[PDB]
Amino acid sequence: SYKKLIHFALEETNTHTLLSPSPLQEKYSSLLSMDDKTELQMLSFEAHKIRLLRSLCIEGSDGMQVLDFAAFPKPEFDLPIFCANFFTTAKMNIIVLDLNPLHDIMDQEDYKEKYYKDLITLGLKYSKLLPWGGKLTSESLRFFSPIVIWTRFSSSPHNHSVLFSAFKDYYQAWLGLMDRSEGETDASQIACNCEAQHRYLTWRSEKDPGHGVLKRLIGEDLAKDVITKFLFNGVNELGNKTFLDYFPEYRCEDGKVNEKRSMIGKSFENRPWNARGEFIG
Ligand SMILES: C=CC1=C(C)/C(=C/c2[nH]c(/C=C3N=C(/C=C4\NC(=O)C(C)=C4C=C)C(C)=C\3CCC(=O)O)c(CCC(=O)O)c2C)NC1=O
Ligand SMILES: [Cl-]
Ligand SMILES: [Mg+2]
Ligand SMILES: [Mg+2]
Numbered sequence: 001s002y003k004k005l006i007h008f009a010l011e012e013t014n015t016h017t018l019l020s021p022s023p024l025q026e027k028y029s030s031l032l033s034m035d036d037k038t039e040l041q042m043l044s045f046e047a048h049k050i051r052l053l054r055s056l057c058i059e060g061s062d063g064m065q066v067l068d069f070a071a072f073p074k075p076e077f078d079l080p081i082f083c084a085n086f087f088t089t090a091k092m093n094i095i096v097l098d099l100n101p102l103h104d105i106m107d108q109e110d111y112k113e114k115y116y117k118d119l120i121t122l123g124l125k126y127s128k129l130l131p132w133g134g135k136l137t138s139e140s141l142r143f144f145s146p147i148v149i150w151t152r153f154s155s156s157p158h159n160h161s162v163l164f165s166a167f168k169d170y171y172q173a174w175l176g177l178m179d180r181s182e183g184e185t186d187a188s189q190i191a192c193n194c195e196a197q198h199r200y201l202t203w204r205s206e207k208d209p210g211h212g213v214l215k216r217l218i219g220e221d222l223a224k225d226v227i228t229k230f231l232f233n234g235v236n237e238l239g240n241k242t243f244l245d246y247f248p249e250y251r252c253e254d255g256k257v258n259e260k261r262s263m264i265g266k267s268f269e270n271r272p273w274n275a276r277g278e279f280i281g
Contacts, residue, residue, distance in 0.1 A: 002067035005167050006055050016175045019045040028230045033217040049077045063090030075194035077181040082174045098148040102196050120277040123147025126166045132271040138264035146277035198239030199246050205232040206243045
């Protein structure tokens with residue numbers, strides 16, 4: 001049960017700071033699927049440095065277990081975004097676990113060395129235990145860190161045990177970053193951190209792979225509501241640019257968003273970072 005990972009994370013967070021209830025708890029807590037057989041459980045909090053810590057947990061009556069757990073920092077704290085997205089069936093697991101970088105780590109080097117230099121060892125430990133998931137939407141790499149755990153594996157006691165240990169080790173590392181995060185003082189830099197987060201939220205609210213599953217469970221209208229106002233809350237408030245403003249490649253011949261998840265196509269059949277965290281893909 002992924003609920004135990006949520007309990008772990010909330011307990012650990014309250015040893016590094018004090019969580020307060022998010023106002024979203026008044027509008028997003030429990031939601032049944034349309035056929036009433038599956039329950040969506042949602043929690044939301046905030047802290048002095050955390051704009052939104054929220055979780056969605058789904059435990060269906062046929063082996064389906066889903067976890068979407070994220071911590072979004074306030075724009076004054078340029079912390080990575082903690083990201084745990086686990087899609088599990090009775091046999092299969094499709095897993096993304098990462099400290100998503102707020103700013104670009106592809107071309108520039110300052111942000112990458114600021115947050116990930118001391119974490120390469122952690123990424124190396126679990127990249128051996130949870131192998132690269134294979135080819136994936138190329139545009140998604142723009143948001144992944146050198147220590148990302150992208151993996152597919154069949155269910156087993158051993159594999160889920162490794163997954164639990166990875167979540168806990170990665171979340172404790174993120175909390176250690178939070179300890180050291182000092183508030184930004186430059187006003188324009190705060191704006192830059194805010195646009196970077198809004199851009200992140202705009203990508204995922206439009207293209208995150210789990211949206212199809214949510215729409216099947218609770219219908220198009222409520223799914224879009226949960227996506228834009230809970231899971232990626234901030235797409236409406238942190239900026240005015242649209243998805244097509246950030247990613248004009250997706251503008252279709254009709255002026256709408258291209259139905260394709262990936263304009264480039266899926267690539268990177270092998271992990272595109274080496275054992276030292278240098279991008280090689
Ligand atoms: C920057 C952010 C980021 C994240 C976290 C993410 C995860 C992610 N989920 C995937 C599959 C998948 N994910 C899901 C389902 C779910 N998945 C969930 O994370 C949840 C909460 C559900 C359920 C409601 C399913 C069903 C598949 C396989 C089918 C498909 O690929 O559409 C894939 C492989 C497919 C691809 O390459 O597109 C990735 C990279 N990708 C990103 O770009
Ligand atoms: Cl697939
Ligand atoms: Mg402790
Ligand atoms: Mg109902």
